[PDB]
Scaffold this motif. Structure first.
Motif, PDB file in Angstrom:
ATOM      1  N   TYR B  70     -21.067  22.382  34.815  1.00 51.93           N
ATOM      2  CA  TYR B  70     -20.054  22.467  35.850  1.00 51.93           C
ATOM      3  C   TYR B  70     -19.400  23.839  35.920  1.00 51.93           C
ATOM      4  O   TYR B  70     -19.296  24.434  36.991  1.00 51.93           O
ATOM      5  CB  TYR B  70     -18.979  21.412  35.635  1.00 51.93           C
ATOM      6  CG  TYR B  70     -17.890  21.512  36.671  1.00 51.93           C
ATOM      7  CD1 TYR B  70     -18.158  21.239  38.007  1.00 51.93           C
ATOM      8  CD2 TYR B  70     -16.611  21.951  36.325  1.00 51.93           C
ATOM      9  CE1 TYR B  70     -17.191  21.395  38.985  1.00 51.93           C
ATOM     10  CE2 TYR B  70     -15.622  22.117  37.289  1.00 51.93           C
ATOM     11  CZ  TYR B  70     -15.925  21.840  38.613  1.00 51.93           C
ATOM     12  OH  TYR B  70     -14.964  22.009  39.579  1.00 51.93           O
ATOM     13  N   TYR B  71     -18.952  24.345  34.780  1.00 48.60           N
ATOM     14  CA  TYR B  71     -18.320  25.650  34.771  1.00 48.60           C
ATOM     15  C   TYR B  71     -19.269  26.793  35.148  1.00 48.60           C
ATOM     16  O   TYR B  71     -18.835  27.815  35.680  1.00 48.60           O
ATOM     17  CB  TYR B  71     -17.637  25.893  33.420  1.00 48.60           C
ATOM     18  CG  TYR B  71     -16.313  25.171  33.365  1.00 48.60           C
ATOM     19  CD1 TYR B  71     -16.217  23.881  32.851  1.00 48.60           C
ATOM     20  CD2 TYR B  71     -15.176  25.736  33.941  1.00 48.60           C
ATOM     21  CE1 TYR B  71     -15.029  23.165  32.919  1.00 48.60           C
ATOM     22  CE2 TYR B  71     -13.982  25.037  34.022  1.00 48.60           C
ATOM     23  CZ  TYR B  71     -13.922  23.753  33.510  1.00 48.60           C
ATOM     24  OH  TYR B  71     -12.754  23.039  33.624  1.00 48.60           O
ATOM     25  N   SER B  72     -20.561  26.615  34.883  1.00 47.16           N
ATOM     26  CA  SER B  72     -21.541  27.630  35.245  1.00 47.16           C
ATOM     27  C   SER B  72     -21.678  27.598  36.761  1.00 47.16           C
ATOM     28  O   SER B  72     -21.720  28.637  37.419  1.00 47.16           O
ATOM     29  CB  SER B  72     -22.904  27.330  34.615  1.00 47.16           C
ATOM     30  OG  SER B  72     -22.889  27.564  33.215  1.00 47.16           O
ATOM     31  N   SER B  73     -21.733  26.393  37.312  1.00 50.93           N
ATOM     32  CA  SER B  73     -21.879  26.232  38.747  1.00 50.93           C
ATOM     33  C   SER B  73     -20.731  26.897  39.486  1.00 50.93           C
ATOM     34  O   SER B  73     -20.873  27.272  40.648  1.00 50.93           O
ATOM     35  CB  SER B  73     -21.951  24.751  39.113  1.00 50.93           C
ATOM     36  OG  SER B  73     -20.712  24.105  38.871  1.00 50.93           O
ATOM     37  N   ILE B  74     -19.585  27.029  38.823  1.00 51.83           N
ATOM     38  CA  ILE B  74     -18.448  27.684  39.455  1.00 51.83           C
ATOM     39  C   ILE B  74     -18.216  29.074  38.866  1.00 51.83           C
ATOM     40  O   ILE B  74     -17.151  29.659  39.038  1.00 51.83           O
ATOM     41  CB  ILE B  74     -17.151  26.842  39.345  1.00 51.83           C
ATOM     42  CG1 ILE B  74     -16.816  26.559  37.882  1.00 51.83           C
ATOM     43  CG2 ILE B  74     -17.313  25.556  40.140  1.00 51.83           C
ATOM     44  CD1 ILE B  74     -15.448  25.927  37.690  1.00 51.83           C
ATOM     45  N   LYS B  75     -19.227  29.583  38.168  1.00 48.69           N
ATOM     46  CA  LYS B  75     -19.194  30.911  37.565  1.00 48.69           C
ATOM     47  C   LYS B  75     -17.984  31.189  36.676  1.00 48.69           C
ATOM     48  O   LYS B  75     -17.297  32.203  36.844  1.00 48.69           O
ATOM     49  CB  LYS B  75     -19.274  31.973  38.667  1.00 48.69           C
ATOM     50  CG  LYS B  75     -20.452  31.795  39.616  1.00 48.69           C
ATOM     51  CD  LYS B  75     -21.775  31.640  38.864  1.00 48.69           C
ATOM     52  CE  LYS B  75     -22.966  31.691  39.818  1.00 48.69           C
ATOM     53  NZ  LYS B  75     -22.805  30.788  40.998  1.00 48.69           N
ATOM     54  N   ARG B  76     -17.736  30.301  35.717  1.00 49.69           N
ATOM     55  CA  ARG B  76     -16.606  30.462  34.817  1.00 49.69           C
ATOM     56  C   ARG B  76     -16.935  30.034  33.392  1.00 49.69           C
ATOM     57  O   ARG B  76     -16.075  29.530  32.671  1.00 49.69           O
ATOM     58  CB  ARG B  76     -15.417  29.656  35.339  1.00 49.69           C
ATOM     59  CG  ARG B  76     -14.877  30.129  36.686  1.00 49.69           C
ATOM     60  CD  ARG B  76     -14.211  31.501  36.571  1.00 49.69           C
ATOM     61  NE  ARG B  76     -13.557  31.913  37.813  1.00 49.69           N
ATOM     62  CZ  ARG B  76     -14.156  32.578  38.797  1.00 49.69           C
ATOM     63  NH1 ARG B  76     -15.430  32.920  38.693  1.00 49.69           N
ATOM     64  NH2 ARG B  76     -13.480  32.890  39.898  1.00 49.69           N
ATOM     65  N   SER B  77     -18.179  30.233  32.980  1.00 40.51           N
ATOM     66  CA  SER B  77     -18.577  29.863  31.631  1.00 40.51           C
ATOM     67  C   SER B  77     -17.799  30.697  30.626  1.00 40.51           C
ATOM     68  O   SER B  77     -17.547  31.875  30.862  1.00 40.51           O
ATOM     69  CB  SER B  77     -20.068  30.102  31.433  1.00 40.51           C
ATOM     70  OG  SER B  77     -20.813  29.437  32.436  1.00 40.51           O
ATOM     71  N   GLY B  78     -17.419  30.077  29.511  1.00 34.80           N
ATOM     72  CA  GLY B  78     -16.686  30.781  28.473  1.00 34.80           C
ATOM     73  C   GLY B  78     -15.232  31.046  28.814  1.00 34.80           C
ATOM     74  O   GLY B  78     -14.484  31.559  27.989  1.00 34.80           O
ATOM     75  N   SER B  79     -14.823  30.689  30.025  1.00 36.89           N
ATOM     76  CA  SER B  79     -13.447  30.911  30.447  1.00 36.89           C
ATOM     77  C   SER B  79     -12.465  30.007  29.709  1.00 36.89           C
ATOM     78  O   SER B  79     -12.861  29.060  29.021  1.00 36.89           O
ATOM     79  CB  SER B  79     -13.307  30.657  31.940  1.00 36.89           C
ATOM     80  OG  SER B  79     -13.350  29.267  32.200  1.00 36.89           O
ATOM     81  N   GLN B  80     -11.179  30.300  29.877  1.00 39.44           N
ATOM     82  CA  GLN B  80     -10.117  29.527  29.238  1.00 39.44           C
ATOM     83  C   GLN B  80     -10.120  28.091  29.751  1.00 39.44           C
ATOM     84  O   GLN B  80      -9.891  27.153  28.990  1.00 39.44           O
ATOM     85  CB  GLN B  80      -8.750  30.154  29.525  1.00 39.44           C
ATOM     86  CG  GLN B  80      -7.592  29.486  28.787  1.00 39.44           C
ATOM     87  CD  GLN B  80      -6.237  29.768  29.427  1.00 39.44           C
ATOM     88  OE1 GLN B  80      -5.879  30.922  29.674  1.00 39.44           O
ATOM     89  NE2 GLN B  80      -5.475  28.709  29.694  1.00 39.44           N
ATOM     90  N   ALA B  81     -10.366  27.925  31.047  1.00 40.83           N
ATOM     91  CA  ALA B  81     -10.392  26.598  31.639  1.00 40.83           C
ATOM     92  C   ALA B  81     -11.556  25.783  31.075  1.00 40.83           C
ATOM     93  O   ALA B  81     -11.451  24.570  30.910  1.00 40.83           O
ATOM     94  CB  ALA B  81     -10.500  26.705  33.156  1.00 40.83           C
ATOM     95  N   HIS B  82     -12.654  26.467  30.766  1.00 43.26           N
ATOM     96  CA  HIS B  82     -13.847  25.821  30.230  1.00 43.26           C
ATOM     97  C   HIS B  82     -13.661  25.281  28.809  1.00 43.26           C
ATOM     98  O   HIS B  82     -13.979  24.121  28.538  1.00 43.26           O
ATOM     99  CB  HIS B  82     -15.026  26.801  30.264  1.00 43.26           C
ATOM    100  CG  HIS B  82     -16.317  26.215  29.787  1.00 43.26           C
ATOM    101  ND1 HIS B  82     -17.450  26.973  29.585  1.00 43.26           N
ATOM    102  CD2 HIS B  82     -16.652  24.944  29.449  1.00 43.26           C
ATOM    103  CE1 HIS B  82     -18.424  26.200  29.139  1.00 43.26           C
ATOM    104  NE2 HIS B  82     -17.961  24.963  29.048  1.00 43.26           N
TER     105      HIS B  82
END
Ligand code: HEM
Ligand code: HEM
Ligand SMILES: N=C(N)n1cc2cccc([N+](=O)[O-])c2n1
Ligand SMILES: N=C(N)n1cc2cccc([N+](=O)[O-])c2n1
Ligand SMILES: O=[N+]([O-])c1cccc2cn[nH]c12
Ligand SMILES: O=[N+]([O-])c1cccc2cn[nH]c12
Ligand SMILES: C[As](C)(=O)[O-]
Ligand SMILES: C[As](C)(=O)[O-]
Ligand SMILES: [Zn+2]
Lengths: 414, 416
Positions: B70-82
């Protein structure tokens, strides 16, 4: 471990235990299925880089011999034991061995019987086997092939047959028939980049012309054979026209269909596959039965990368080739297939339609279930290229595996 | 070269390598010794109602995997939200044994599951799926409301829109939400005395279950079955679909005038209702989805399979063909005409439909998009190629690699 196999048209169920006899791996793994691939990356009989492990070969030889004596009901008999010893005596000393004519005959019939992609296996017991292991020149290969063709054709009353040339040997070139089939039509690459004749044969047609063949310019020119004796440049031989029976295509009701000038040969003789029996490999073992109408009317005449004649027939039928939704393609294909069946029946030449053929395959599945408790089959090849669900095999689940004796693909000799 | 399956298209001579299969985490039915790819129901997926919740760890890794997707699909892998969402999911599994998806996450998984279906030829439409969230549903009667809204929105007076309605997931020790019917719209199968079946032979059982649960049967060949909906731990309740909501198309032929007199017809909305939707370890036992028909499913399979309406011979007789010999190709001729009839009748009625030629072509395009987007596309050749005119379509000449990727739609045991 044993696969439960179901037929969704009749609710019937069976278990395939024969697959347990398989000792050779396929391309599939639990992670992904590759059964839709036409060829393997390297299951393919890789040119003997040298003698195969004595143990390995001896192991495959013993199983075959065992298979053979079981066939003639003299299993465990004296001949059996003594035959196994002869085999062991030969591998140990020479690193290989040789089959006996009857063993060869049995091996061939089993190879056909085991071919997962063949829908005509019900005929597996009726195979004329020509032992051509007594051959030392491409010229000799050409005489054998002519005899095979003459016998096979039998004036239109086709009879299944195979001719077996010398097995492969360590450190020596293989005997090879460069052509994919003994009879194919030239593919002439013309200036405009298009192609006259059969597009799938551009390369081979090239190699021929390369070796001195005088090319034609027709759309249906029978190609000459490139026969290759061990470590010798392949030789060119022209098939005597009268030996090559052809069927002019016409249509039962559509008068103009004949004006198209279409035609196909009677004998489907695969010549590029390798026959493996008990560890021994036969690089030149052309075989033939008879055509199933769809291979000509659908695949050879309608594949986009082949004669691709759909639109022409469609325009001649005056069909709305403007949109896919008019099913113009489906309509023209049926007529093209009808023409073939009609024509072949008129020329009194053996042929089988896809309905008749798959019905017979269903019967074969039953005979094999009782005879061996299973039958390796490749669903994507057993179901015809048109009217798939309209035939019984479509609704029949199948297990695919490799049994030996077997027919395998091998590298193109060039 | 590459340590990945090499895939070839024999018409165009082109090559591609599927590296996407490397992401598979679910084993299929094949082994190096034998291919079971042709089997319809591989006892693998078949999400057999597991007694208790999946092993807390089996579920955790699955969930962790989905969240990462999911987070990859929204381009936010490794992010704080992830990493937070990861902590959120685990914390939840730790205190309850399971977890819940956020709205967008469900929308994403639903689309991915369709995107991942190896047997569907219409995946070029995957990104355009209307996801109805119905995880608040608490009664069979409410399930009926949602299903009716689904049918309403999905049918859209003939201009069909793909959609899926997601009911409450499976909960630790608490009955499943289930739709007993295999499709929201299907014709009854009436057992006769002579032994034959009037209607659709495929639905004899479901028909006899509706009757036993109170349905007052009809006696036609095209009677729409009522719905048997099941709320958690309650017996299934029966519901009859309001006729006006079930759009149907009488069938007729463009040139064969007598065809119409056969009184054949079919419904416009194809809505699989018995499949389990799995996302990140969670199991949605009731989540009917629908798109639109590919003409061959109606004209060839439903109308011509020998174990279904089996109308091939009748039509052939009407066409005055020789049904006494296989070489006359009377089956091929009738089938083509029946298929043309389906395409013609739907168009005339302004109801969305796609022929096997256009569909397969769009799929080739879809394969190209996925090759660049994911490095491959799981596809079941025997199901992508149409039931008629196989090699006349472009997909026949395209090798395919088959593997399971999740989210996914899986078959599930019948609730009874
Ligand atoms: C009696 C007539 C026969 C008929 C009607 C028949 C028909 C067929 C057909 C339709 C195919 C698949 C073609 C395709 O889908 O592309 C096939 C493949 C095959 N057949 Fe038969 N067959 C017959 C005889 C034979 C014989 C005599 C042998 C061997 C001794 C044989 C060996 C094979 C093999 C090995 C394959 C697979 C070849 C490949 O992988 O390309 N067939 N056959
Ligand atoms: C856009 C219109 C669509 C078309 C034309 C279409 C067409 C098809 C066809 C032809 C089949 C296989 C039929 C067979 O060979 O038996 C299929 C299977 C399938 N489709 Fe699609 N589809 C569409 C939309 C959808 C949607 C919206 C979903 C899910 C959200 C979906 C999920 C699946 C699944 C899971 C299967 C396999 C079912 C099984 O294994 O029996 N399809 N589709
Ligand atoms: N296109 C499909 N639905 N099918 C693809 C298949 C492959 C093997 C067997 C099948 N049977 O038995 O139905 C089958 N149906
Ligand atoms: N019956 C057959 N010849 N074929 C079965 C097949 C399965 C997958 C791809 C194929 N291609 O590409 O030709 C194919 N041909
Ligand atoms: O279509 N065929 O008839 C056909 C195809 C492939 C191989 C053989 C061998 N005999 N007939 C064959
Ligand atoms: O044939 N179909 O159109 C078809 C078959 C199976 C499922 C769905 C969903 N939309 N269309 C479908
Ligand atoms: C030959 As006709 C057009
Ligand atoms: C109904 As018609 C003959
Ligand atoms: Zn497989």
């Amino acid at each position: 471990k044993f696969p439960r196999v179901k037929n969704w048209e009749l609710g019937s169920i069976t278990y395939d235990t024969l697959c347990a006899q398989s000792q050779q791996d396929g391309p599939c793994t639990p992670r992904r299925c590759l059964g839709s691939l036409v060829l393997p990356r390297k299951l393919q009989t890789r040119p003997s880089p040298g003698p195969p492990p004595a143990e390995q070969l001896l192991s495959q030889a013993r199983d075959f011999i065992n298979q053979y004596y079981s066939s003639i009901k003299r299993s465990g008999s004296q001949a059996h034991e003594e035959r196994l010893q002869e085999v062991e005596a030969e591998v140990a000393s020479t690193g290989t061995y040789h089959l006996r004519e009857s063993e060869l005959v049995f091996g061939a019939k089993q190879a056909w019987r085991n071919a997962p992609r063949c829908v005509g296996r019900i005929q597996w017991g009726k195979l004329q086997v020509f032992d051509a292991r007594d051959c030392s020149s491409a010229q000799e290969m050409f005489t054998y092939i002519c005899n095979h063709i003459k016998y096979a054709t039998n004036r239109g009353n086709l009879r299944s047959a195979i001719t077996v040339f010398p097995q492969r040997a360590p450190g020596r070139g293989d005997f090879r028939i460069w052509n994919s089939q003994l009879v194919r039509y030239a593919g002439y690459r013309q200036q405009d980049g298009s192609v006259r004749g059969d597009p799938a044969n551009v390369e081979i047609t090239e190699l021929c012309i390369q070796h001195g063949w005088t090319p034609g310019n027709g759309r249906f020119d029978v190609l000459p054979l490139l026969l290759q004796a061990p470590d010798e440049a392949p030789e060119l031989f022209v098939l005597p026209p009268e030996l090559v029976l052809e069927v002019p295509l016409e249509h039962p009701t559509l008068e103009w269909f004949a004006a198209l000038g279409l035609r196909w040969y009677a004998l489907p003789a695969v010549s590029n596959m390798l026959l493996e029996i008990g560890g021994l490999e036969f690089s030149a073992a052309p075989f033939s039965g008879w055509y199933m109408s769809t291979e000509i009317g659908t695949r050879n005449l309608c594949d986009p990368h082949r004669y691709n004649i759909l639109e022409d027939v469609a325009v001649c039928m005056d069909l709305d080739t403007r949109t896919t939704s008019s099913l113009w393609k489906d309509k023209a294909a049926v007529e093209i297939n009808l023409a073939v069946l009609h024509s072949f029946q008129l020329a009194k030449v053996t042929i089988v339609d896809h309905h008749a053929a798959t019905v017979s395959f269903m019967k074969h599945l039953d005979n094999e279930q009782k005879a061996r408790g299973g039958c390796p089959a490749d669903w994507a090849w057993i179901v015809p290229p048109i009217s798939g669900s309209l035939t019984p095999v479509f609704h029949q689940e199948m297990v695919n595996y490799i049994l030996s004796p077997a027919f395998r693909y091998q590298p193109d000799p060039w």
